[PDB]
Amino acid sequence: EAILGLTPCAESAKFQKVLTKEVKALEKREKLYEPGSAPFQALEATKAKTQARFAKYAESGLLCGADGLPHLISDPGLAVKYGHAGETLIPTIGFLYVAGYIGTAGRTYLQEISTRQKPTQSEIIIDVPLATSIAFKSWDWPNKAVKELASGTLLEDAKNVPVSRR
Amino acid sequence: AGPARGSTVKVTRPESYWYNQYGKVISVDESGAIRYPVVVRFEKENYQGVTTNNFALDELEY
Amino acid sequence: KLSDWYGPNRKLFLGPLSDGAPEHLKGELPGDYGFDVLGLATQPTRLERYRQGEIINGRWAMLGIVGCIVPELLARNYGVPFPEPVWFKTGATVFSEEGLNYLGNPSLIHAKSIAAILVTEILFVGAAEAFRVSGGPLGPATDLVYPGKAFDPLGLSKDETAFAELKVKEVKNGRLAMLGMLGLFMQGFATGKGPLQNLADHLADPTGANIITFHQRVLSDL
Amino acid sequence: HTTDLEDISRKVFSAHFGQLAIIEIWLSGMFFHGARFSNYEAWLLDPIHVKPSAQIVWPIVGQEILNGD
Amino acid sequence: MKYFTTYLSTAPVVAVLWFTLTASLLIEINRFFPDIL
Amino acid sequence: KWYGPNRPKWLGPLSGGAVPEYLKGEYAGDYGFDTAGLAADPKLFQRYRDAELQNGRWAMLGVLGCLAPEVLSNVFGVPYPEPVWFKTGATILNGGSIDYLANPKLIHASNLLLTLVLELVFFFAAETWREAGEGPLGKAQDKSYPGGVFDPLGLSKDPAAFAEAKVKEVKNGRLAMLAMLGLFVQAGVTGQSPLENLSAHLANPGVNFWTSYAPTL
Amino acid sequence: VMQAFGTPEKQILIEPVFAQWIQSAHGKNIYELNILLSSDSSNAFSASQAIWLPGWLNGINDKSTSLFLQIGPGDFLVHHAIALGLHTTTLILVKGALDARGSRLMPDKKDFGYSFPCDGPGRGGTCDISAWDAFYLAVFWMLNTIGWTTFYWHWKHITLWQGNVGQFNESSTYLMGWLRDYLWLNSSQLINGYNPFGMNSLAVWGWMFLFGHLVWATGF
Numbered sequence: 002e003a004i005l006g007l008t009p010c011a012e013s014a015k016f017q018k019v020l021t022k023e024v025k026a027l028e029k030r031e032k033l034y035e036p037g038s039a040p041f042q043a044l045e046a047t048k049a050k051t052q053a054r055f056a057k058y059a060e061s062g063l064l065c066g067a068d069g070l071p072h073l074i075s076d077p078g079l080a081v082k083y084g085h086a087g088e089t090l091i092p093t094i095g096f097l098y099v100a101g102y103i104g105t106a107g108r109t110y111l112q113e114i115s116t117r118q119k120p121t122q123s124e125i126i127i128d129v130p131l132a133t134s135i136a137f138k139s140w141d142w143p144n145k146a147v148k149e150l151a152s153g154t155l156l157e158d159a160k161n162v163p164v165s166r167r
Numbered sequence: 168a169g170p171a172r173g174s175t176v177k178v179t180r181p182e183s184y185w186y187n188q189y190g191k192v193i194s195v196d197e198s199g200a201i202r203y204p205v206v207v208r209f210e211k212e213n214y215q216g217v218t219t220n221n222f223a224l225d226e227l228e229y
Numbered sequence: 230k231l232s233d234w235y236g237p238n239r240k241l242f243l244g245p246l247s248d249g250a251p252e253h254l255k256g257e258l259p260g261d262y263g264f265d266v267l268g269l270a271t272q273p274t275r276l277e278r279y280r281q282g283e284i285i286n287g288r289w290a291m292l293g294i295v296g297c298i299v300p301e302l303l304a305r306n307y308g309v310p311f312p313e314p315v316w317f318k319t320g321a322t323v324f325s326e327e328g329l330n331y332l333g334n335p336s337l338i339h340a341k342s343i344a345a346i347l348v349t350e351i352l353f354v355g356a357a358e359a360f361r362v363s364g365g366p367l368g369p370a371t372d373l374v375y376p377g378k379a380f381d382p383l384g385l386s387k388d389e390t391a392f393a394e395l396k397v398k399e400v401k402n403g404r405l406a407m408l409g410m411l412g413l414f415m416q417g418f419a420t421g422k423g424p425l426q427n428l429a430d431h432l433a434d435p436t437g438a439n440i441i442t443f444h445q446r447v448l449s450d451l
Numbered sequence: 452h453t454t455d456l457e458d459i460s461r462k463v464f465s466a467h468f469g470q471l472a473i474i475e476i477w478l479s480g481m482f483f484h485g486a487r488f489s490n491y492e493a494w495l496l497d498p499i500h501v502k503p504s505a506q507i508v509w510p511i512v513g514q515e516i517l518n519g520d
Numbered sequence: 521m522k523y524f525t526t527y528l529s530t531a532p533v534v535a536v537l538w539f540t541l542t543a544s545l546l547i548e549i550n551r552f553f554p555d556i557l
Numbered sequence: 558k559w560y561g562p563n564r565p566k567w568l569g570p571l572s573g574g575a576v577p578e579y580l581k582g583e584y585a586g587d588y589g590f591d592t593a594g595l596a597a598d599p600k601l602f603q604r605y606r607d608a609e610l611q612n613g614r615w616a617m618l619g620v621l622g623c624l625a626p627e628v629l630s631n632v633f634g635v636p637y638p639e640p641v642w643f644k645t646g647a648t649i650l651n652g653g654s655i656d657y658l659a660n661p662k663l664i665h666a667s668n669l670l671l672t673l674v675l676e677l678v679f680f681f682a683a684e685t686w687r688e689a690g691e692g693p694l695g696k697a698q699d700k701s702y703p704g705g706v707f708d709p710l711g712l713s714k715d716p717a718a719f720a721e722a723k724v725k726e727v728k729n730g731r732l733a734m735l736a737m738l739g740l741f742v743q744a745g746v747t748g749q750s751p752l753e754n755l756s757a758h759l760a761n762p763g764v765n766f767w768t769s770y771a772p773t774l
Numbered sequence: 775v776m777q778a779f780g781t782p783e784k785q786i787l788i789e790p791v792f793a794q795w796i797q798s799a800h801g802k803n804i805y806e807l808n809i810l811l812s813s814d815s816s817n818a819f820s821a822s823q824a825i826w827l828p829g830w831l832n833g834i835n836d837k838s839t840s841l842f843l844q845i846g847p848g849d850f851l852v853h854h855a856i857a858l859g860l861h862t863t864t865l866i867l868v869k870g871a872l873d874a875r876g877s878r879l880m881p882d883k884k885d886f887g888y889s890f891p892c893d894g895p896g897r898g899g900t901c902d903i904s905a906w907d908a909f910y911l912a913v914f915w916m917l918n919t920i921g922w923t924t925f926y927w928h929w930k931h932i933t934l935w936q937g938n939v940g941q942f943n944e945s946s947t948y949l950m951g952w953l954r955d956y957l958w959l960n961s962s963q964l965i966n967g968y969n970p971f972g973m974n975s976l977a978v979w980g981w982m983f984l985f986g987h988l989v990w991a992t993g994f
């Protein structure tokens with residue numbers, strides 16, 4: 002469905018122009034080699050991939066501009082109403098899960114070693130068992146996050162936080 | 168009163184690196200002429216690279 | 230001596246590189262190479278339950294792998310008339326017309342109803358498992374994994390040291406068999422052929438039939 | 452580290468051997484890339500027209516375009 | 521080997537190893553499932 | 558049904574060695590079942606207890622909500638567009654609306670993302686109050702068993718009846734969880750409604766089984 | 775890297791839908807969004823005593839005027855660059871003003887004043903610790919940020935006025951486009967202002983162009 006003045010890539014002539022332009026370049030390169038030789042095969046693999054890629058973009062409801070290149074929709078309302086949520090909105094959730102995981106693993110390891118005798122030695126020599134255990138137990142990180150938040154164990158109190166003369 | 172040797176204090180001197188942080192008491196001087204009798208040791212070194220400092224009683228929370 | 234497999238001088242999984250073992254794996258268990266990278270056995274209750282678990286899954290795997298191999302072995306290298314000799318296809322053969330006939334021979338069992346097989350399995354194996362845990366007709370449940378009265382007729386577990394070496398031999402044969410089984414599952418998914426067909430294709434063209442070739446084929450079908 | 456000039460000399464001499472080892476790996480690499488991923492035997496027939504090449508790129512993420520003619 | 525694993529546990533070795541695996545994984549995904557936009 | 562040291566257990570009469578030590582019959586639904594040792598840590602056991610009750614109560618409302626609009630369409634003539642549970646949802650897609658009791662003057666909802674966002678926001682509030690154990694609706698008596706506004710009939714006032722009813726709740730919860738897992742797998746395998754699945758096994762006890770779908774794998 | 779590998783279809787080209795919505799509300803009908811002044815049936819449009827509206831709508835839907843230029847992915851990227859510059863300039867200046875009286879590295883900064891060199895190599899070293907130094911640092915960021923805004927304004931107009939708005943739409947999504955189709959291309963006449971053949975009236979701007987290069991470099 003054409004929105005925001007954009008055409009769907011599946012029914013855009015400029016899209017086809019682009020595909021033609023890439024495939025023609027590859028043909029020109031192929032002229033130099035012999036139809037059985039291994040460079041030839043490489044250029045054929047390249048061309049195959051190329052045509053496949055354009056076909057994929059065509060059956061994905063991507064939206065082309067005047068340049069004939071696909072454009073992404075980032076307002077979540079527009080994305081969900083017109084079937085474009087896979088462009089930005091799903092990746093959002095995907096990034097925020099993995100970033101929360103990495104944070105949780107890092108915070109966890111740091112809070113664990115902080116109770117050791119020399120905690121700074123465990124920062125330059127990683128406790129690898131401890132780190133692997135933390136990395137694999139941290140797949141359900143919102144458990145820990147919402148617990149820490151609602152309980153109050155997420156934030157240090159202001160009285161315990163070093164601060165300047167203000 | 169003084170803190171006990173080995174006790175934990177919180178610095179309340181605003182110009183100090185260790186403000187709002189906790190240190191161990193190592194020594195208290197008992198003379199009244201001394202202006203900063205309590206010696207405190209901290210885990211985190213300051214920008215100078217030292218880890219100890221003298222304090223008065225009115226700059227500690229014990 | 231039982232020292233290459235027990236105590237602080239045991240052989241560990243990283244070989245020469247090994248500079249010690251985790252603390253929860255003390256070397257008081259058979260097959261302790263100090264391998265607990267994900268630290269699943271850091272609690273002692275879990276380490277007990279997973280010890281039993283490992284041995285039971287192992288034993289069942291050893292019976293499984295043998296059961297999964299041999300009716301293919303007869304049907305190929307001996308010529309026993311099995312309808313569907315491949316283990317993952319067997320089981321639909323109770324919904325055939327000739328049924329489940331032991332060794333091909335149509336008078337040997339001739340099962341047709343899955344309801345009877347299921348109900349007898351639930352009863353029989355339900356009993357046998359509940360006895361295993363709580364104790365039953367064949368003795369008390371003093372040891373949960375090594376009973377040894379009725380279940381050691383040849384008196385093999387009497388010589389202490391030999392018992393402690395055989396213990397390690399059990400676990401290690403059990404581990405091999407669990408990897409073998411896992412291999413049967415994945416090769417089943419990958420190839421859609423039977424295990425000994427796979428072994429035949431490997432033996433025909435070793436380079437051009439393996440898991441690398443398989444991944445290539447996947448990649449060629451995009 | 453030390454004040455002893457003997458200990459320093461020893462470290463220097465031994466570090467020098469390590470530098471020669473890394474140089475030798477680097478040369479061996481150049482000869483290997485020349486034997487296995489080059490057009491040296493083609494270039495030897497036609498030095499004027501064939502352009503020397505001894506680094507191939509793997510096809511991934513579109514980088515194969517760097518494998519020129 | 522008696523302290524070799526502790527050397528492998530140090531930060532730049534663990535970093536090189538972790539990035540190499542993480543990179544390798546992303547390369548292999550981008551071999552199998554290319555051109556995700 | 559009970560507590561204590563001589564309660565019903567999960568292997569029945571043959572449940573001598575089948576009980577771990579940490580399950581001492583203090584909490585509802587202790588049949589001494591924990592073969593993977595998950596509850597050996599007692600903080601983890603408190604967590605899991607809350608989780609088992611959250612999954613259960615949600616599973617109960619779920620199974621009632623997956624069946625009710627199908628029943629209303631079947632029994633009464635309520636004209637739901639796609640009344641099956643795994644087909645509801647798609648009604649709000651395209652240009653279609655969601656009308657409660659198939660009446661287009663009732664909710665008439667057409668904006669999927671506005672629906673979802675309202676749900677997450679409402680839940681972010683209510684779940685944060687749940688986890689804290691204090692909120693607008695009051696302070697909880699127990700994390701899993703809040704009481705107050707949540708118990709308007711005062712059925713938790715009697716101690717023994719409360720102790721029984723905890724065992725009723727956890728057992729209905731477990732059943733409902735197995736029901737819901739049933740619904741999911743049935744839809745995944747048979748591709749038909751769960752009332753059609755029941756009708757098919759009521760009409761014919763025989764072949765109409767999981768062992769009509771098993772041969773195809 | 776997508777342009778370099780010959781695959782422009784794999785660029786990330788986010789539409790600026792929130793700015794296109796605002797433009798739609800003002801009366802531009804190129805985005806087919808039909809709201810407020812771009813809907814005929816709205817209260818805002820049909821406000822009886824509006825009367826500025828016919829003039830306004832004529833203006834806003836005329837390509838020649840710069841009254842709400844059309845925008846796309848190239849516009850999205852540069853607006854985020856400008857945002858980066860505004861925030862980063864603000865951060866340097868706000869830190870300057872809020873750490874003016876003191877910090878942890880120097881708790882008595884107010885006693886030295888606005889401008890002083892440093893507090894010596896002690897405490898790890900203290901170059902550029904005064905509030906004046908924050909200002910000095912912020913001026914580079916401010917020149918960079920107005921640089922980015924004027925380069926965008928210029929290239930966007932130069933392409934609109936020549937007619938080839940495609941040039942800006944295509945090239946502005948990657949940095950070699952700015953370098954090649956803006957800086958490199960539009961410097962051709964300037965650097966020919968005086969040549970071995972002769973000189974034209976662009977010779978003063980030619981010379982002032984190299985003079986600027988020299989004065990900038992002398993500052994380093």
Ligand code: CLA
Nearest residue numbers: 103104105106107108109110111127128131132133135136
């Ligand atoms: C446990 C690791 C960890 C966690 C949870 C955080 C969390 C945060 N950082 Mg910090 N930071 C970290 C490490 C961490 N950081 C490190 C290692 C550096 C040095 C490069 C920084 C440098 C830094 C700066 C300069 C800023 C932040 C800021 C922030 C805050 C906002 C989010 C952000 O800006 O991300 C950005 C994160 C980075 C730029 C650093 C990348 C962190 C890596 C990818 C993850 C940790 C790596 C670690 C080695 C993992 C080992 C774990 C293993 C042994 C189990 C947030 C509180 C910002 C802030 O103050 O917000 C108000 C801010 O300006 N961080």
Ligand SMILES: CC1=C(C#C/C(C)=C/C=C/C(C)=C/C=C/C=C(C)/C=C/C=C(C)/C=C/[C@@]23O[C@]2(C)C[C@@H](O)CC3(C)C)C(C)(C)C[C@H](O)C1
Nearest residue numbers: 591592593594612615616619622623642645734735737738
């Ligand atoms: C205890 C124990 C063990 C165990 C265990 C077991 C058996 C665990 C099993 C857990 C299980 C099986 C838990 C399912 C929950 C399902 C829920 C929450 C359903 C909600 C459903 C809801 C809220 C929503 C329904 C709908 O949205 C749907 C779907 C579609 C819509 O149209 C309609 C509505 C909105 C109504 C081990 C591991 C075996 C050993 C260990 O040692 C001890």
